[PDB]
Design a protein around this motif. Structure first.
Motif, PDB file in Angstrom:
ATOM      1  N   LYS A  78      17.015 -10.520 -18.703  1.00 38.24           N
ATOM      2  CA  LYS A  78      15.655 -10.125 -19.056  1.00 38.24           C
ATOM      3  C   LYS A  78      14.840 -10.106 -17.767  1.00 38.24           C
ATOM      4  O   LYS A  78      14.068 -11.016 -17.458  1.00 38.24           O
ATOM      5  CB  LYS A  78      15.073 -11.072 -20.098  1.00 38.24           C
ATOM      6  N   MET A  79      15.028  -9.035 -16.999  1.00 39.86           N
ATOM      7  CA  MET A  79      14.392  -8.866 -15.698  1.00 39.86           C
ATOM      8  C   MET A  79      12.999  -8.281 -15.886  1.00 39.86           C
ATOM      9  O   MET A  79      12.851  -7.126 -16.298  1.00 39.86           O
ATOM     10  CB  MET A  79      15.233  -7.971 -14.789  1.00 39.86           C
ATOM     11  N   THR A  80      11.984  -9.084 -15.586  1.00 41.36           N
ATOM     12  CA  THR A  80      10.621  -8.591 -15.542  1.00 41.36           C
ATOM     13  C   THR A  80      10.160  -8.458 -14.093  1.00 41.36           C
ATOM     14  O   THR A  80      10.820  -8.913 -13.152  1.00 41.36           O
ATOM     15  CB  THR A  80       9.686  -9.515 -16.318  1.00 41.36           C
ATOM     16  N   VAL A  81       8.998  -7.825 -13.923  1.00 38.88           N
ATOM     17  CA  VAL A  81       8.451  -7.604 -12.589  1.00 38.88           C
ATOM     18  C   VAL A  81       8.178  -8.934 -11.897  1.00 38.88           C
ATOM     19  O   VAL A  81       8.358  -9.069 -10.680  1.00 38.88           O
ATOM     20  CB  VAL A  81       7.185  -6.730 -12.674  1.00 38.88           C
ATOM     21  N   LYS A  82       7.746  -9.940 -12.661  1.00 36.21           N
ATOM     22  CA  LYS A  82       7.406 -11.228 -12.066  1.00 36.21           C
ATOM     23  C   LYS A  82       8.636 -11.911 -11.477  1.00 36.21           C
ATOM     24  O   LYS A  82       8.625 -12.339 -10.317  1.00 36.21           O
ATOM     25  CB  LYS A  82       6.739 -12.125 -13.108  1.00 36.21           C
ATOM     26  N   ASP A  83       9.713 -12.014 -12.262  1.00 36.11           N
ATOM     27  CA  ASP A  83      10.953 -12.592 -11.751  1.00 36.11           C
ATOM     28  C   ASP A  83      11.509 -11.754 -10.609  1.00 36.11           C
ATOM     29  O   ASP A  83      12.079 -12.287  -9.648  1.00 36.11           O
ATOM     30  CB  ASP A  83      11.981 -12.705 -12.876  1.00 36.11           C
ATOM     31  N   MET A  84      11.343 -10.435 -10.706  1.00 41.62           N
ATOM     32  CA  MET A  84      11.795  -9.524  -9.663  1.00 41.62           C
ATOM     33  C   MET A  84      11.132  -9.847  -8.328  1.00 41.62           C
ATOM     34  O   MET A  84      11.808 -10.052  -7.309  1.00 41.62           O
ATOM     35  CB  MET A  84      11.466  -8.102 -10.123  1.00 41.62           C
ATOM     36  N   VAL A  85       9.803  -9.948  -8.335  1.00 40.49           N
ATOM     37  CA  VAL A  85       9.053 -10.266  -7.125  1.00 40.49           C
ATOM     38  C   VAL A  85       9.370 -11.680  -6.657  1.00 40.49           C
ATOM     39  O   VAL A  85       9.420 -11.955  -5.451  1.00 40.49           O
ATOM     40  CB  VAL A  85       7.550 -10.067  -7.378  1.00 40.49           C
ATOM     41  N   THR A  86       9.579 -12.602  -7.599  1.00 46.58           N
ATOM     42  CA  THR A  86       9.899 -13.974  -7.227  1.00 46.58           C
ATOM     43  C   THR A  86      11.200 -14.039  -6.440  1.00 46.58           C
ATOM     44  O   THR A  86      11.275 -14.701  -5.399  1.00 46.58           O
ATOM     45  CB  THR A  86       9.985 -14.849  -8.477  1.00 46.58           C
TER      46      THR A  86
END
Ligand SMILES: Nc1ncnc2c1ncn2[C@@H]1O[C@H](COP(=O)(O)OP(=O)(O)OP(=O)(O)O)[C@@H](O)[C@H]1O
Ligand SMILES: Nc1ncnc2c1ncn2[C@@H]1O[C@H](COP(=O)(O)OP(=O)(O)OP(=O)(O)O)[C@@H](O)[C@H]1O
Ligand SMILES: [Zn+2]
Ligand SMILES: [Zn+2]
Lengths: 184, 96, 362, 145, 48
Positions: free
Chosen positions: A147-155
């Protein structure tokens, strides 16, 4: 010497350049030992002279002390030298230098640890950084990041560079430690 | 003053030949002509080596050119040094 | 999935590379703001208190907000540097190593000096499959092959350059053709060339500007533990402003001469210390009360320290600070000592330093 | 306007002596040395102010004990207990001093920080008193040339 | 300024003739031509 003379006095003779191509290797071998000057000949013409230069003479000329003496001589002649005495001073310098190179040839008759430590530190620290990928254990992270969201992506994007910067700090510390061990 | 003297030395050596004294542009009409002239035709190291060779050579074994230069060096005349002229300038028509 | 993650990563990289310089200006502005707020700081009661005293009272939260923002911008400036200027460094390094390999045989004919960290570290990238990753010329391995394949042996050149021999012919012959999608984690892991990334990371770590940015970020982090560590970031103005470069170049142009002048001054002062220690030890009492004498030249090291500190900083020389020599058998010698000290040290050597700066300007 | 104000206060007429720079062309040559490199001269002062601020930071964190400026022991007058006061001290007294801040602050003999304080004083004298003022003078001389 | 003025005087006298004003190179097409011209043909002492 004969072939160089012929070539330089007949610059556009095709038969001569083909013959030089045949004679290529010998000329290359004898290039360092071949001297070439121009003089005002007896026939009121500029004549080019070919002679032999010895390996010992060339080495003694290229020794650094002779180079420093040459630089000093040129400085003196250019700054406080006249046009009358230029060739006289040049000949005097040539004579003195010839004597000193002959005497030198006569008499002449028969860090790493820090670089290694720095390279070892680079290798080790970069290896420790790359073990994280080399474990091939990214499956556990992929479980949660499916469940890849933008927030985890940037993190993760920031975390990679943070890990790189930590590795650089560790490498610098290791370099300082190794340098202290070396100096002690 | 010291810095200016060093700059003057550099400028003189880069703009005119030590022996003949001709400017760089005349030789530079041919590409790399100035350095060719100052490193193969009129090299001062070559004159030094020629003096070495002529002194260390036997007088009886001298050629005609060597004998001319030897006599004239013994009498301390420096006319044999090319001043204001060179091979290219003498043979402008034939060489080019 | 991957087609979206890679695209978004590329967008972020492009944004940071675009805004690298603006963030470097913003870091300096925040550094000036933090240091101006820190100027209204006082100690209280020893008991050392981190107490900011001000009439408004809002500058205290502002300091924490500004410190956090400065650390974030410092991290972003490292990211932007990596996205923008690392590729140029890698391109130049790959160009240099390729040219040395081809036109000098730096690893075929000759070998690095064993003291060149750059040359020794570049041995890793030759065997890599992803060589000229940034440099345009992709035929450097086939050029070195054609240049040194006969004299030094094709099988040895191929081993040095990491060229695989049998695969080309075995693929040109009857060969199975079936590709495999990179979407698999195993595929994306196998795609990465570990050795090339190792060499690239080593080059980045050895890069000077990256090291300076890492130092900047480290000091920004330490500023949270101690707020006065943020003052080190004011040393960044020399690089931030090109106008200060002209002024500083006067000092840096003749830095070697300026250091040698200080060394020579230290030697001259040491000689004067020797003379004073051997002959004029009586005039170096520095105590007003007669009961306890405080002699500054009974010891060689103490006397040299005195001459280097007090005598040099004095406007008139060591004679301004040592006892008056009137009515003594060594009056003339001591007067000569003082006058020569004043002339050689105070007048001439400082004039040499100033002349070096002026000559650098000119 | 200044001529009119001179009637209310006669000393306002002294501002008209600032007109010599424009009245005489001879003073133009002298003043052009200063005005030729005015931007560099201002930046040099800014850099001096930054270097002095860094020295103030160091002194405030580590050498607050040597900045007592009171002779009578009953009332201590400390010039570096406050950041702004310490910076003011360094910018005014230390800069105008011929030998640096060490000429005005307490002698460090017999202290655990003696070596560090000596380095502090010597570096202050070298960088501020010697080099930066030399930069200003060199700017003026280079403008002349 | 004084040093530069002295250098300028030296350069002018070494590069061009005092009387005619022709450059040194034109006379130097013949060896020693400039000094021959400035010491026998166009010597200012000779005019005096
Ligand atoms: N007759 C001449 N012989 C040699 N060089 C000359 C001559 N005339 C002019 N030059 C100039 O001298 C230059 C070479 O400089 P020089 O011989 O002083 O040494 P360098 O380049 O400083 O260094 P190195 O000491 O390594 O030889 C040439 O590039 C050329 O411009
Ligand atoms: N018309 C001229 N007459 C004389 N010298 C000239 C003339 N034009 C140019 N010169 C230059 O003047 C140089 C001679 O210099 P000058 O007559 O000033 O004296 P000097 O060499 O300094 O020394 P001295 O006082 O011993 O004669 C010549 O070498 C030449 O280059
Ligand atoms: Zn020549
Ligand atoms: Zn004339």
């Amino acid at each position: 010497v004969l072939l160089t003379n012929l070539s330089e006095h007949m610059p556009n003779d095709t038969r001569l350049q083909t013959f030089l191509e045949l004679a290529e290797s010998v000329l290359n071998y004898f290039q360092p030992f071949l001297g070439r000057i121009e003089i005002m000949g007896s026939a009121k013409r500029i004549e080019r002279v070919y002679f032999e230069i010895s390996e010992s003479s060339r080495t003694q000329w290229e020794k650094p002390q002779v180079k420093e003496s040459k630089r000093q001589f040129i400085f003196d002649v250019v700054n406080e030298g006249g046009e009358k005495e230029k060739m006289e001073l040049f000949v005097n310098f040539c004579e003195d230098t010839i004597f000193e190179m002959q005497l030198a040839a006569q008499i002449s008759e028969s860090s790493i640890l820090t670089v290694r430590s720095a390279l070892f530190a680079l290798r080790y620290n970069i290896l420790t950084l790359m073990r994280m990928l080399s474990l091939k254990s990214l499956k556990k992270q992929m479980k949660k990041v499916k469940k890849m969201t933008v927030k985890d992506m940037v993190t993760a994007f920031f975390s990679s560079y943070w890990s790189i910067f930590m590795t650089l700090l560790h490498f610098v510390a290791s370099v300082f430690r190794g340098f202290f061990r070396i100096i002690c | 003053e010291l810095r200016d003297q060093q700059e003057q030395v550099k400028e003189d050596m880069e703009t005119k030949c030590f022996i003949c004294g001709i400017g760089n542009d005349y030789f530079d009409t041919v590409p790399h002509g100035f350095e060719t002239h100052t490193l193969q035709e009129h090299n001062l190291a070559n004159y030094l080596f020629f003096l070495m060779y002529l002194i260390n050579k036997d007088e009886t074994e001298h050629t005609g050119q060597e004998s001319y230069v030897w006599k004239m060096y013994q009498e301390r005349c420096w006319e044999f040094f090319p001043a204001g002229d060179c091979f290219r300038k003498q043979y402008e028509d034939q060489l080019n | 999935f991957w087609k979206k993650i890679i695209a978004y990563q590329q967008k972020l990289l492009n944004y940071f590379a675009r805004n690298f310089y603006n963030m470097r200006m913003l870091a300096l502005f925040v550094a000036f703001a933090i240091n101006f707020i820190l100027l209204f700081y006082k100690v209280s009661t020893i008991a050392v208190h981190y107490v900011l005293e001000e009439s408004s009272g809002y500058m205290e939260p502002t300091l924490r907000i500004l410190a956090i923002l400065h650390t974030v911008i410092s991290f972003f400036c490292i990211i932007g540097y990596y996205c923008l200027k690392v590729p140029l460094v890698i391109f130049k390094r790959e160009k240099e190593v390729a040219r040395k390999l081809e036109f000098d045989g730096l690893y075929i004919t000759e070998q690095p000096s064993e003291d060149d960290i750059k040359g020794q570290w570049d041995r890793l990238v030759i065997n890599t499959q992803s060589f000229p990753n940034n440099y345009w010329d992709k035929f450097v391995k086939r050029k070195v092959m054609d240049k040194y394949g006969e004299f030094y042996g094709r099988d040895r050149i191929s081993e040095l350059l990491g060229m695989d021999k049998a695969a080309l012919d075995f693929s040109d012959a009857r060969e199975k053709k079936k590709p495999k999608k990179d979407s698999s984690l195993s595929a994306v892991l196998n795609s990465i060339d570990v050795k090339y990334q190792m060499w690239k990371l080593g080059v980045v770590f050895t890069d000077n500007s990256f090291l300076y940015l890492a130092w900047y970020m480290t000091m920004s982090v330490l500023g949270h533990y101690n707020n006065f560590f943020f003052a080190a970031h004011l040393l960044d103005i020399a690089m931030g402003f090109k106008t200060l470069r002209t002024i500083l170049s006067s000092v840096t142009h003749n830095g070697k001469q300026l250091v040698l002048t200080v060394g020579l001054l230290a030697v001259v002062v040491y000689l004067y210390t020797v003379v004073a220690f051997n002959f004029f030890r009586k005039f170096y009492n520095k105590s007003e009360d007669g009961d306890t004498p405080d002699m500054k030249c009974d010891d060689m090291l103490t006397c040299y320290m005195f001459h280097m500190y007090v005598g040099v900083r004095a406007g008139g020389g060591i004679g301004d600070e040592i006892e008056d020599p009137a009515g003594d058998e060594y009056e003339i010698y001591r007067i000569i000592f003082d006058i020569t000290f004043f002339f050689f040290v105070i007048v001439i050597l400082l004039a040499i330093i100033q002349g070096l700066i002026i000559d650098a300007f000119g």
